[PDB]
PDB file of C-alpha atoms and ligand atoms in Angstrom:
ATOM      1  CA  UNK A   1    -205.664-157.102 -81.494  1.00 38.21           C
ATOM      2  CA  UNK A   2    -201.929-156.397 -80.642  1.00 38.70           C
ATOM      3  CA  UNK A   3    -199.218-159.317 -81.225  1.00 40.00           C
ATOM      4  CA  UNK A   4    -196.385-158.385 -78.602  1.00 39.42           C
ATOM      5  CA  UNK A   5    -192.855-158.108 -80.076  1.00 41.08           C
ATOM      6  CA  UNK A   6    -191.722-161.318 -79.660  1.00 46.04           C
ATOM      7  CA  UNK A   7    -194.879-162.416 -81.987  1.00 44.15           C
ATOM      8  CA  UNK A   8    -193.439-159.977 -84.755  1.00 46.37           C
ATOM      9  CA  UNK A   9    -189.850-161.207 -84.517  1.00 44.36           C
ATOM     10  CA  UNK A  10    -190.963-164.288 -85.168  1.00 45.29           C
ATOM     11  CA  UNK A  11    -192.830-163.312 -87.870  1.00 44.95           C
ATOM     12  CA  UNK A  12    -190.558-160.915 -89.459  1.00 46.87           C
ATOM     13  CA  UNK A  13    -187.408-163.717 -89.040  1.00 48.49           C
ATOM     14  CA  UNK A  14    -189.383-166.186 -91.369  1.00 50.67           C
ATOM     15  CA  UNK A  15    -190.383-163.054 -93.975  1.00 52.19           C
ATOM     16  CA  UNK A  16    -186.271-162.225 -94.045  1.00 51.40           C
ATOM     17  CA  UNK A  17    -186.323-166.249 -95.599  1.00 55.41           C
ATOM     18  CA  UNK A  18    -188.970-165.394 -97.995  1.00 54.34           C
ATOM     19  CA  UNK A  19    -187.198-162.138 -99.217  1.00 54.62           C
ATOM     20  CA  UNK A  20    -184.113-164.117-100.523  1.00 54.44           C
ATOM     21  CA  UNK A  21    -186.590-165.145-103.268  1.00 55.36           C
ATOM     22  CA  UNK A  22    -189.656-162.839-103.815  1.00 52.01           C
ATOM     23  CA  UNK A  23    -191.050-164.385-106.943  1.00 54.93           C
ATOM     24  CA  UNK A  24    -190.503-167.903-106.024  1.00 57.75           C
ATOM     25  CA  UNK A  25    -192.395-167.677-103.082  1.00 60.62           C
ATOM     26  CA  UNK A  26    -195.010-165.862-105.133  1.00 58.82           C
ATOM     27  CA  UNK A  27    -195.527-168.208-107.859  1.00 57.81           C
ATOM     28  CA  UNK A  28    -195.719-170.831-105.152  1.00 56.72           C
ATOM     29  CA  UNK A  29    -198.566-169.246-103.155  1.00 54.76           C
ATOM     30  CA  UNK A  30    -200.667-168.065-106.265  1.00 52.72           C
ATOM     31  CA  UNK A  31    -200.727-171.377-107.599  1.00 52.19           C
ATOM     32  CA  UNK A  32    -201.303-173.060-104.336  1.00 52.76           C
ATOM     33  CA  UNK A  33    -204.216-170.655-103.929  1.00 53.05           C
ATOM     34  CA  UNK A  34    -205.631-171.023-107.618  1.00 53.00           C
ATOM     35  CA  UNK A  35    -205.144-174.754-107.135  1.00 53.47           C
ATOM     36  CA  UNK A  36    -206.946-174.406-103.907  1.00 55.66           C
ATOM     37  CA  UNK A  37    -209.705-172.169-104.697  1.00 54.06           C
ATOM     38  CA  UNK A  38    -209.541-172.076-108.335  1.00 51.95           C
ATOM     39  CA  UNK A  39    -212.687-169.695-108.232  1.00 56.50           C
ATOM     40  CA  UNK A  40    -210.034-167.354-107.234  1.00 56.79           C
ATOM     41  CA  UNK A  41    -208.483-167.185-110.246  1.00 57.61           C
ATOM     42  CA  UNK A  42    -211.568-165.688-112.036  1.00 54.86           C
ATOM     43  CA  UNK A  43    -210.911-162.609-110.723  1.00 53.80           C
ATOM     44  CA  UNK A  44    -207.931-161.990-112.794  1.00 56.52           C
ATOM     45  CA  UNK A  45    -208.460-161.070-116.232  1.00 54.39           C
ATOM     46  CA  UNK A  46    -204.819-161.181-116.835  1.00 55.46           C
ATOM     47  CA  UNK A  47    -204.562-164.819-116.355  1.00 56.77           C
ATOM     48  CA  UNK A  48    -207.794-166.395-116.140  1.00 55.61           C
ATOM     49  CA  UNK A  49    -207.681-168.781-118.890  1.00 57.47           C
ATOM     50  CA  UNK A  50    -204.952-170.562-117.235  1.00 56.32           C
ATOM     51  CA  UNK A  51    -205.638-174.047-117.426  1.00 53.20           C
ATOM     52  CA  UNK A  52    -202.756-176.102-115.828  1.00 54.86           C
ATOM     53  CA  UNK A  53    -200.285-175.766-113.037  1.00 56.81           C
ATOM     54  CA  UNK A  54    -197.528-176.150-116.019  1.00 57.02           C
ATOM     55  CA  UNK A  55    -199.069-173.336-117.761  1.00 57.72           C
ATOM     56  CA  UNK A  56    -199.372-171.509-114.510  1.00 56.48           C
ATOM     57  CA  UNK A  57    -195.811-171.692-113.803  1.00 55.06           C
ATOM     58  CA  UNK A  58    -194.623-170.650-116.985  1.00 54.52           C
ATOM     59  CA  UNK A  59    -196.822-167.333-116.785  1.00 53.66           C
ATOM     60  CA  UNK A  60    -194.501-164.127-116.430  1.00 54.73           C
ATOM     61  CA  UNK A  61    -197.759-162.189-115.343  1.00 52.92           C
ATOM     62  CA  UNK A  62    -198.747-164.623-112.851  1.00 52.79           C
ATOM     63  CA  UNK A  63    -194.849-164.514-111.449  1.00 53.47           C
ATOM     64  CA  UNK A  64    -194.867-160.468-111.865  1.00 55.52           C
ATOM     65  CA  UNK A  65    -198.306-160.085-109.480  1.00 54.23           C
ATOM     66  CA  UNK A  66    -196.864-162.581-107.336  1.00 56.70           C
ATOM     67  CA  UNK A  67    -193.908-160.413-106.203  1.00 54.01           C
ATOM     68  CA  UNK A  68    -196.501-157.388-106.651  1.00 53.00           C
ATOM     69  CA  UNK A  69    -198.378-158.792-103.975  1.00 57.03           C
ATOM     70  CA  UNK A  70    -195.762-160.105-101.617  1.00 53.20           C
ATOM     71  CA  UNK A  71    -193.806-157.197-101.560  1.00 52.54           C
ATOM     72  CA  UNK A  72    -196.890-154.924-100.446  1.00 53.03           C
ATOM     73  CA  UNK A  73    -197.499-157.473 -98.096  1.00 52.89           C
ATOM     74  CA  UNK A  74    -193.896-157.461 -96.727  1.00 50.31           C
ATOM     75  CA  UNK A  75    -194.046-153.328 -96.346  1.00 50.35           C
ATOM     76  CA  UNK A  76    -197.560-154.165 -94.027  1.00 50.40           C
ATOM     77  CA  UNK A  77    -195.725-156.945 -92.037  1.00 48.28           C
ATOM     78  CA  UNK A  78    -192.896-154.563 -91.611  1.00 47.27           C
ATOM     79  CA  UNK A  79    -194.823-151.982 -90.097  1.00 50.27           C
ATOM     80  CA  UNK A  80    -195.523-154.111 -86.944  1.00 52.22           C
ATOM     81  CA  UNK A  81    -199.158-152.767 -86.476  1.00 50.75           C
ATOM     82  CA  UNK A  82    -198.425-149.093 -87.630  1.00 49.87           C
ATOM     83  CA  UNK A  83    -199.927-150.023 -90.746  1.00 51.95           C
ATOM     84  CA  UNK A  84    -202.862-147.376 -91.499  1.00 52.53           C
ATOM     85  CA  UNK A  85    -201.290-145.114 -94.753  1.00 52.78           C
ATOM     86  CA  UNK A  86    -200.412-148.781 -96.339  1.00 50.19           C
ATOM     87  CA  UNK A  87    -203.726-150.260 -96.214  1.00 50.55           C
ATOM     88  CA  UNK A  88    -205.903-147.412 -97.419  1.00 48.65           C
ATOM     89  CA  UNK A  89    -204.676-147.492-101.034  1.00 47.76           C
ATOM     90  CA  UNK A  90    -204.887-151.513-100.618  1.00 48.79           C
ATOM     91  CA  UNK A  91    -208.454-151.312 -99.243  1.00 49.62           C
ATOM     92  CA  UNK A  92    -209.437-149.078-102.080  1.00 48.74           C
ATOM     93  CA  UNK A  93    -208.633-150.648-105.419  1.00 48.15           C
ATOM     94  CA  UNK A  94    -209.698-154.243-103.499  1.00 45.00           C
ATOM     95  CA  UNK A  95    -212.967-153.168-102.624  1.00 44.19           C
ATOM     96  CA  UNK A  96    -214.076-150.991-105.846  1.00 42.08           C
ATOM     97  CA  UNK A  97    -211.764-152.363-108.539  1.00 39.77           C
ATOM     98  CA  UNK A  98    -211.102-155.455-107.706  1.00 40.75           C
ATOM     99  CA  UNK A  99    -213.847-156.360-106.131  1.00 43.23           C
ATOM    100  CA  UNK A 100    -212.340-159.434-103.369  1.00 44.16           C
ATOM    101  CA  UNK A 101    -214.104-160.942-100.636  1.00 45.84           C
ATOM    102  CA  UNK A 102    -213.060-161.084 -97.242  1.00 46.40           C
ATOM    103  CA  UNK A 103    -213.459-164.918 -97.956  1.00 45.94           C
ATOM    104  CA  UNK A 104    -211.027-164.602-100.510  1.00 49.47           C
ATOM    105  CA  UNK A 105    -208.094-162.976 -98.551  1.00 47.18           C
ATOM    106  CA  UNK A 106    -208.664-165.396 -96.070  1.00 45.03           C
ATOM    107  CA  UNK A 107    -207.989-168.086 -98.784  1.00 43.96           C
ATOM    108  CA  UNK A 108    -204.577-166.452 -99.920  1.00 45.53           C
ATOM    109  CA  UNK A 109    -203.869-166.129 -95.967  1.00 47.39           C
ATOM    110  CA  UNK A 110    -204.496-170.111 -96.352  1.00 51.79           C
ATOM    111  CA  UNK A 111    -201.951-170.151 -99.089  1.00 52.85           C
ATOM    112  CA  UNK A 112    -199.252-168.182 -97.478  1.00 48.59           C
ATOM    113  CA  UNK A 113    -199.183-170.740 -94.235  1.00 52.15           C
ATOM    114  CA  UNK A 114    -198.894-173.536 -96.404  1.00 51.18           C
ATOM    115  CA  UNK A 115    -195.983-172.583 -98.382  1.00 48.66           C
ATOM    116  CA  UNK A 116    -193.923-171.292 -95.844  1.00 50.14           C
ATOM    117  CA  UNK A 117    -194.491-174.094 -93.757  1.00 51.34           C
ATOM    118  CA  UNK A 118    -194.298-176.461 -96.846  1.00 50.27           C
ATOM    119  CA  UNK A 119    -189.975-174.753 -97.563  1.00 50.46           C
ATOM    120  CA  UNK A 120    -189.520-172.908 -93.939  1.00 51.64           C
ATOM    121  CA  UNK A 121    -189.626-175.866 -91.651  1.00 52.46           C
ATOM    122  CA  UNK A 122    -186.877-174.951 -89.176  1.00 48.24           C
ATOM    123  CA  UNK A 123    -188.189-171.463 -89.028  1.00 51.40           C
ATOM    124  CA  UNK A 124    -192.081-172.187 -88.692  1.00 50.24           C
ATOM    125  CA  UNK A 125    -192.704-174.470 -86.252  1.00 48.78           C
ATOM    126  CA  UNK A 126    -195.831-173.649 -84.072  1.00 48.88           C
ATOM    127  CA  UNK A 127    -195.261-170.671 -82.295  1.00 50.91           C
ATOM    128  CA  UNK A 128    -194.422-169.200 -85.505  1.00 50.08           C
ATOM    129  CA  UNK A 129    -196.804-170.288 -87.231  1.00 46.40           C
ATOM    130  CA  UNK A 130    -199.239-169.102 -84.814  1.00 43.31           C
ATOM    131  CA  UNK A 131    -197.380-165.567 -84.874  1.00 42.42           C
ATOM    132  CA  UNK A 132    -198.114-165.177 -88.543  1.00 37.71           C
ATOM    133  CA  UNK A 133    -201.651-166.376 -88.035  1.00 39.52           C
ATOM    134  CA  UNK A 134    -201.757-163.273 -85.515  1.00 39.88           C
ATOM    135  CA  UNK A 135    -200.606-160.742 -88.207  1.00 38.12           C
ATOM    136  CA  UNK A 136    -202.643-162.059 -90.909  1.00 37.56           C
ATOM    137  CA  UNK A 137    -205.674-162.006 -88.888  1.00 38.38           C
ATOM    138  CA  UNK A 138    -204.930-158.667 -87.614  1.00 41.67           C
ATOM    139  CA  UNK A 139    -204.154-157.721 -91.461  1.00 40.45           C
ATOM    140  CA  UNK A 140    -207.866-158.940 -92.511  1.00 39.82           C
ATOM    141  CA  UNK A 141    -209.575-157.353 -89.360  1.00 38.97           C
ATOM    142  CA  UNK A 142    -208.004-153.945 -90.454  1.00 37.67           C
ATOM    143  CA  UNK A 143    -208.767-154.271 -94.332  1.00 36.69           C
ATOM    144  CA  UNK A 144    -213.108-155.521 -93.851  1.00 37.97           C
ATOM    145  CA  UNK A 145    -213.199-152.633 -90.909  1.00 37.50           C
ATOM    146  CA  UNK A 146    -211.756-150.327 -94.115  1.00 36.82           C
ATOM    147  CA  UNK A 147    -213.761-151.946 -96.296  1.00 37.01           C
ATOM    148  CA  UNK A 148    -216.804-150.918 -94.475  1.00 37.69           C
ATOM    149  CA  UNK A 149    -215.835-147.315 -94.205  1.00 37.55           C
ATOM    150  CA  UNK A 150    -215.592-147.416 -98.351  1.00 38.01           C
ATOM    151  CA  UNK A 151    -219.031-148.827 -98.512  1.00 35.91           C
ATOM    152  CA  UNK A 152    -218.338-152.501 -99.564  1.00 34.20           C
ATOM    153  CA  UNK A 153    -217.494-154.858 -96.418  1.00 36.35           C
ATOM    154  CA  UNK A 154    -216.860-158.290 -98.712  1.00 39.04           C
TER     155      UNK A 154
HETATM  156  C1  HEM B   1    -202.020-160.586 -99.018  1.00 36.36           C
HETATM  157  C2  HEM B   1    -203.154-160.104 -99.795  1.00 36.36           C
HETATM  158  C3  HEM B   1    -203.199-159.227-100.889  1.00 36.36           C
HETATM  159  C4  HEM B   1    -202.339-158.237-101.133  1.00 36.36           C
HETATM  160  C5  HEM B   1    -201.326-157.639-100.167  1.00 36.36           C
HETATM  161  C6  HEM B   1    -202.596-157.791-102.522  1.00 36.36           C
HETATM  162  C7  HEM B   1    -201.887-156.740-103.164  1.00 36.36           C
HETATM  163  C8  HEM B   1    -202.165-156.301-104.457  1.00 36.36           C
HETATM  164  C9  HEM B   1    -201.391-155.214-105.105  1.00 36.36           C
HETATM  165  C10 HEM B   1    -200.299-154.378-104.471  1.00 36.36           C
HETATM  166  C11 HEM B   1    -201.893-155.072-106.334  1.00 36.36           C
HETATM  167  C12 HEM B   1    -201.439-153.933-107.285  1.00 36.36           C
HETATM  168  C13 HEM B   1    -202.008-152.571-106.985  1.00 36.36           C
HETATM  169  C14 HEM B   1    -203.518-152.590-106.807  1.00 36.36           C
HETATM  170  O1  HEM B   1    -204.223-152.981-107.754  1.00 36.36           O
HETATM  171  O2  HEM B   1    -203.992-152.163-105.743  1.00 36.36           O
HETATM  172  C15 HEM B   1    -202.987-156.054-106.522  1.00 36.36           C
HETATM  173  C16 HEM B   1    -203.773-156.127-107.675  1.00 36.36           C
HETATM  174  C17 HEM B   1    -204.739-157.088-107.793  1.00 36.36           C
HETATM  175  N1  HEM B   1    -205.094-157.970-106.827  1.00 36.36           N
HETATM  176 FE1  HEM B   1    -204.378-158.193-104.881  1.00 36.36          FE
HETATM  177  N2  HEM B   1    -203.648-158.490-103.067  1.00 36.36           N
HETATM  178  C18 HEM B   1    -204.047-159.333-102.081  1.00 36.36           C
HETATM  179  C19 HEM B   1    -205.016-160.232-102.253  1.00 36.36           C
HETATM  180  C20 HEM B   1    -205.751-160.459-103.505  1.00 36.36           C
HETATM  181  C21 HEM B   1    -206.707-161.531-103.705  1.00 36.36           C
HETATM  182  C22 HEM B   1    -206.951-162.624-102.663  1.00 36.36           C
HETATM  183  C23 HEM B   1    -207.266-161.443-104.991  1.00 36.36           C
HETATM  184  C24 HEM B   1    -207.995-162.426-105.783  1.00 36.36           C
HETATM  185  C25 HEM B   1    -208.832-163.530-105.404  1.00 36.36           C
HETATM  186  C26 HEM B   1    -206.658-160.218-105.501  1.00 36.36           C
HETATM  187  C27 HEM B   1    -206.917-159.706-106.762  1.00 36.36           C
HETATM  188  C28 HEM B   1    -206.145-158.748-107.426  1.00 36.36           C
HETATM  189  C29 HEM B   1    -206.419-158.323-108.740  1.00 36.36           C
HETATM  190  C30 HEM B   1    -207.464-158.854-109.684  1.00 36.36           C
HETATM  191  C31 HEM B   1    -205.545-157.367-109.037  1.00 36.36           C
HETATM  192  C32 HEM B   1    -205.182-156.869-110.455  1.00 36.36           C
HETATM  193  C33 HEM B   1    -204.148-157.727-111.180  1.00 36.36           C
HETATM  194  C34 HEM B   1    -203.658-157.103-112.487  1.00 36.36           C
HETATM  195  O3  HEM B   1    -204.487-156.843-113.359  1.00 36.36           O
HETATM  196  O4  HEM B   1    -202.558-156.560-112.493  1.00 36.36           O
HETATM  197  N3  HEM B   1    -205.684-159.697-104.600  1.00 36.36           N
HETATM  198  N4  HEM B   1    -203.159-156.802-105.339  1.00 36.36           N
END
């Protein structure tokens, strides 16, 4: 797929919001995943045990993987497309180490929409939102076909 340019500004104008706070909008999405799909949470050994949104929220790991993961996510957005080198690494450790389902990275995707529409209201109205959809979709169509190539296609 290819999102024209005018997708990826809109896109990119709503990520420049998010950057003002990395780890808040990291804790938020983590939690509103876990919360949502708490199966998700059993793949990290770090914070498994969890056992409360409280408990959640007061968890400097949970925060640190939070920015972790939106700030590689950022570097992909950024790219507009161009994203190859970036995802290869990503692809890698997800598929062998990790071990994550397509299913489950379309969960998070879940979780991203949600909070930015939940504290970006002005900014992600409907053609936005649909513009992110775009790059998230493209960004999960890139990372099974890689996925494949490395032998585990989740
Ligand atoms: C927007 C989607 C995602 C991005 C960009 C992302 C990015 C990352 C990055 C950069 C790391 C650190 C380096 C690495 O291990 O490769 C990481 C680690 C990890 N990720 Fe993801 N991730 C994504 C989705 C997920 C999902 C959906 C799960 C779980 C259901 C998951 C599970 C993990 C685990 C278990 C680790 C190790 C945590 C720790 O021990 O430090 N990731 N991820």
């Amino acid at each position: 797929m290819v999102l024209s340019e005018g997708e990826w500004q809109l896109v990119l104008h709503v990520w420049a919001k998010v950057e003002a706070d990395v780890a808040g909008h990291g804790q938020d999405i983590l939690i509103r995943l876990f919360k949502s799909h708490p199966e998700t949470l059993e793949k990290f050994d770090r914070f498994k045990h969890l056992k409360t949104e409280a408990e959640m929220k007061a968890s400097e790991d949970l925060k640190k993987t939070g920015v972790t993961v939106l700030t590689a996510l950022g570097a992909i957005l950024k790219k507009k497309g161009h994203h190859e080198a970036e995802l290869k690494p990503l692809a890698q450790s997800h598929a062998t180490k990790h071990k994550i389902p397509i299913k489950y990275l379309e969960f998070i995707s879940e979780a991203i929409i949600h909070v930015l529409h939940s504290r970006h209201p002005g900014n992600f109205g409907a053609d936005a939102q649909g513009a992110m959809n775009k790059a998230l979709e493209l960004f999960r169509k890139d990372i099974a076909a890689k996925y494949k190539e490395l032998g585990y296609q989740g």
